Design an enzyme around this catalytic site. Structure first.
Site, PDB file in Angstrom:
ATOM      1  CD  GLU A  17      39.650  87.731  -6.612  1.00 62.62           C
ATOM      2  OE1 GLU A  17      40.089  87.973  -7.770  1.00 62.62           O
ATOM      3  OE2 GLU A  17      39.433  86.548  -6.214  1.00 62.62           O
ATOM      4  CD  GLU A  18      41.179  87.859 -10.647  1.00 59.79           C
ATOM      5  OE1 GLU A  18      42.192  87.415 -10.059  1.00 59.79           O
ATOM      6  OE2 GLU A  18      40.307  87.088 -11.055  1.00 59.79           O
ATOM      7  CG  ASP A  63      38.065  84.458 -11.817  1.00 55.61           C
ATOM      8  OD1 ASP A  63      37.705  85.127 -10.824  1.00 55.61           O
ATOM      9  OD2 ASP A  63      39.266  84.228 -12.071  1.00 55.61           O
ATOM     10  CG  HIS A  98      43.504  83.436 -13.311  1.00 53.81           C
ATOM     11  ND1 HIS A  98      44.297  84.050 -12.392  1.00 53.81           N
ATOM     12  CD2 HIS A  98      42.194  83.783 -12.996  1.00 53.81           C
ATOM     13  CE1 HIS A  98      43.509  84.718 -11.505  1.00 53.81           C
ATOM     14  NE2 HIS A  98      42.223  84.549 -11.879  1.00 53.81           N
ATOM     15  CG  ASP A 127      36.175  83.656  -7.278  1.00 56.44           C
ATOM     16  OD1 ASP A 127      35.768  83.899  -8.394  1.00 56.44           O
ATOM     17  OD2 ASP A 127      37.277  83.897  -6.926  1.00 56.44           O
TER      18      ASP A 127
HETATM   19 CO   LIG Z   1      40.670  85.155 -10.922  1.00 56.63          CO
HETATM   20 CO   LIG Z   2      38.216  85.360  -8.719  1.00 56.18          CO
END
Ligand SMILES: [Co+2]
Ligand SMILES: [Co+2]
Length: 325
Positions: free
Chosen positions: A155-156, A116, A294, A210
């Site tokens: 993105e996060e 990720d 995550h 992703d």
């Molecule tokens: Co992420």
């Molecule tokens: Co991601």
């Protein structure tokens, strides 16, 4: 409505070629090791990762743009820079492959985000490098189609994911390209019945990668619009298995990553701001997410190398088929 570009199936000779990696393995891994570091927005490592992406692609004679800007976040003003590399800037239409290169600012400690999206980042670069010769030849054809790679920043979410806290680089790029006017008359060889009004219309399809690198991902067609493109991924995976080119634990097993069905799942990701602007999206992201998602266990050792090499075969064959390499 049919896909605007007729999709010619990959010759067996090419399928077989795209399907045997072999000792390339070390090349992908050397690439990947560059991304296996914390890549927090604003940080030295992050800046270093961007420099590596830019240099890798410039060295392949791609046009590389750094789309930098500053934006407000729950942590204050932050600098962001998307990387956009285009094989042939003049070609009207782009096959766009994308991922994000920033990593999550994790509350518990140092987060590598190996799936990720360090793996997808390395896969993009590895595709450019491994297909370089064929890509350079394709570029001279004058056929109005090219490959474009986009490494999104930011993105996060910095805090809790929301419309305002996430997707900083994709929101910025989509709006910028949407407001950058152009027309078919200024571009190289646009398709006959195409409507071009701005840069975002040149994205023929956006294939977003992703959360890849864990064992046994399951993909589905998330968009009816791009089912003709998604179905080629299903067909390529099937042909690779028929040929015995997939790495599997035991004999007489097949991969089934690309499911032939569709799912009623909605995944918020870098595609969204483009989706609102009518860019066809193929979202290559597993459902469900990998268990390590995550968490601090989204790390180098939990990657599944055989899966990654199988995905690499599919993506190389896919790009080869789409661009008729
Ligand atoms: Co992420
Ligand atoms: Co991601």
């Amino acid at each position: 409505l049919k896909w605007p570009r007729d999709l010619r199936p990959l010759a067996h000779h090419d399928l077989l070629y795209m399907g045997q990696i072999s000792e390339d393995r070390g090349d992908f891994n050397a690439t990947l090791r560059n991304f296996l570091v914390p890549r927090v927005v604003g940080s030295q490592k992050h800046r270093e990762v961007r420099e590596f992406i830019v240099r890798s692609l410039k060295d392949l004679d791609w046009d590389v743009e750094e789309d930098c800007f500053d934006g407000q976040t729950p942590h204050g003003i932050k600098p962001f820079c998307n990387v956009i590399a285009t094989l042939n800037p003049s070609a009207c239409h782009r096959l766009v492959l994308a991922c994000h290169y920033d990593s999550l600012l994790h509350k518990e400690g140092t987060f590598i985000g190996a799936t990720d999206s360090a793996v997808p980042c390395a896969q993009l670069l590895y595709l450019a490098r491994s297909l370089n010769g064929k890509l350079q030849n394709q570029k001279t054809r004058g056929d109005g189609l090219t490959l474009q790679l986009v490494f999104f920043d930011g993105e996060e979410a910095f805090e809790r994911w929301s419309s305002h806290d996430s997707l900083y680089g994709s929101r910025h790029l989509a709006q910028k390209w949407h407001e950058d006017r152009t027309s078919a008359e200024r571009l190289e060889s646009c398709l006959e019945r195409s409507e071009i009004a701005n840069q975002i219309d040149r994205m023929e399809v956006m294939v977003l990668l992703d959360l890849l690198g864990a064992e046994n991902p399951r993909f589905y067609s998330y968009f009816g619009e791009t089912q003709p493109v998604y179905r080629r991924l299903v067909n390529i995976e099937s042909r690779l298995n028929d040929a015995g080119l997939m790495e599997l634990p035991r004999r007489r097993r097949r991969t089934n990553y690309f499911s032939n069905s569709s799912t009623v799942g909605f995944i918020e990701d870098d595609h969204i701001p483009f989706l609102k602007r009518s860019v066809p999206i193929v979202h290559i992201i597993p459902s469900p997410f990998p268990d390590v998602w995550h968490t601090l266990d989204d790390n180098e050792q939990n990657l599944h190398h055989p899966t990654i090499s199988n995905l690499n075969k599919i993506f190389k064959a896919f790009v080869s088929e789409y661009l008729q390499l």
